[PDB]
């Protein structure tokens, strides 16, 4: 896994 | 998007002085603010993250603080090597946005330039052009007057100057002035001289050579 | 041991495209999001977009949609950004920066300078600035290399393959009337050492794939 799930809230 | 307003735009301080940079966000960004140091030529270097945490290996003199919209960055005692542009950045939401940057410059005691002159190389003369370089090394402050004389006639219109960034060790500047002539023009004269005026010199200095000698 | 190695500076024609590369080493490429950042020299930094090499998923700054396309190649651990329909406003330095945790730009590449121009690339001529009795001061001598007539920027200069750094000054380029650039790199050394020490400037102009060494000796 990568850190996309961690950083997803920053893109909303 | 979120706007980061960074102030001041420049600082001129002496080694050992304290400096504080401020960054204000257009809306709350909690604590997710990063501070970067960008030295000339280099990529930005992360110093402070989550508003107040030093990155690994960052000296103790760098701190940050803030939560919400107002954030500050502090260098407790500025060192010569801290010459750089510093940036704040909000990492709270996309698009991730930076401040406009603060240029930290150092003031120091007056230093006279050491002056050197270089004739054109024999290799360059083969190509039909002659570049004469006058070098002013490690002086302060930046202001300096360089004048070219060829057979004691003041030159206009055939030279270009370039000054370095401030030195990370001794806070000085260096400057070149390059006189460019065709080979034929170069061969028609004998004495090539650059005359340097600077606050650290008691009187103007001239460095000269004789073509061929 | 994270390292991001970006491709060299390039000229590219207006209206054309250019593809920049960012080769990653020292970590698992698919582990972390990777962004690209634009800097105009002396001005601010702008986030372009982010890609996650595990999935290929991309997120763009709205302003760069239709300008920039981010891709990645797992097999070579390389990230790419292609800029299309180039204009004068696309001339800038472009960085790649790698994420960590939820933080966006923790590890940075060295940057790639893009110059948008229809002019052809031209490698530099390198000439010695020889030490002589006219380049001595307080027992020191100065010497250097003149790096003349290249396009586009940048040129880099090392001395003795990177072993000589103390006292070096490499000047910012000047723009000549011809539209080509010129700079010099200089160093101050002991005047006592001119007969026994060797001083070689190493000039690299990546936009033309030109690498030149020049030994600088005192004038006979
Ligand atoms: C981005 O992450 C930081 C840090 O998160 C913590 O540390 C990580 C290593 C991981 O272990 C996480 O699970 C941790 O929560 C967040 O900062 C923290 O936020 C919490 C509240 O959410 C707060 O109680 C902590 O004090 C904060 N820690 C610090 C050092 O400031 C931050 O909120 C995250 N950003 C976003 C937008 O979610």
Author numbering:
A (entry chain A): 81 to 92
B (entry chain L): 1 to 213
C (entry chain H): 1 to 52, 52A, 53 to 82, 82A, 82B, 82C, 83 to 100, 100A, ...
Reproduce, without paraphrasing, sentences from the article in which this PDB structure was first reported:
Pf circumsporozoite protein (PfCSP) is composed of an N-terminal domain (N-CSP), a central repeat region comprising NANP motifs of varied numbers that are interspersed with related NVDP motifs, and a C-terminal domain (C-CSP) that comprises a linker region preceding an α-thrombospondin type-1 repeat domain. Anti-infection vaccines target the sporozoite stage of the Pf life cycle as parasites are transmitted to the human host by infected female Anopheles mosquitoes during a blood meal. It was established four decades ago that mAbs targeting the sporozoite surface circumsporozoite protein (CSP) are capable of neutralizing Plasmodium infection. However, passive transfer of the most potent N-CSP–specific murine mAb 5D5, whose epitope lies immediately upstream of RI, protected mice from infection in only one of the two tested transgenic rodent Plasmodium berghei (Pb) liver burden models that expressed a chimeric PbCSP with the Pf N-CSP domain, and its impact on Pf has not been determined. Here, we characterized the molecular recognition and functional efficacy of the N-CSP–specific monoclonal antibody 5D5.
To understand the molecular basis for mAb 5D5 recognition of PfCSP, we solved the crystal structure of the 5D5 Fab in complex with PfCSP81–98 to 1.85-Å resolution. Consistent with these experiments, we observed strong electron density for N-CSP residues 81–92 (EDNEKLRKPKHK) in the crystal structure. PfCSP residues 83–91 formed an α-helix when bound by 5D5 Fab, in line with secondary structure predictions based on the primary sequence. mAb 5D5 contacts PfCSP with all complementarity-determining regions (CDRs) except κ light chain CDR 2 (KCDR2). The heavy chain CDRs (HCDRs) form the majority of interactions, with 498 Å2 buried surface area (BSA) compared to 160 Å2 BSA for the κ light chain. Furthermore, the mAb 5D5 CDRs possess extensive shape and electrostatic complementarity to this highly charged N-CSP epitope. An electropositive pocket formed by HCDR2 contacts PfCSP residues D82 and E84 via H-bonds with Ser54Oγ, Asn56Nδ2, and Tyr58OH and water-mediated H-bonds with Arg53N and Ser54Oγ. Additionally, an electronegative pocket formed by HCDR2, HCDR3, KCDR1, and KCDR3 contacts PfCSP electropositive residues R87, K90, and H91 via several H-bonds and salt bridges. Importantly, the first N-linked GlcNAc moiety contacts the aliphatic portion of K90 of PfCSP81–98, conferring 48 Å2 of BSA, while the other sugars did not interact with the peptide. In contrast, the 5D5Δg mutant Fab bound PfCSP with weaker affinity (KD of 453 ± 110 nM) due to an 11-fold faster off-rate compared with HEK293F–expressed 5D5 Fab, while the on-rates of all glycoform Fabs remained within the same order of magnitude.
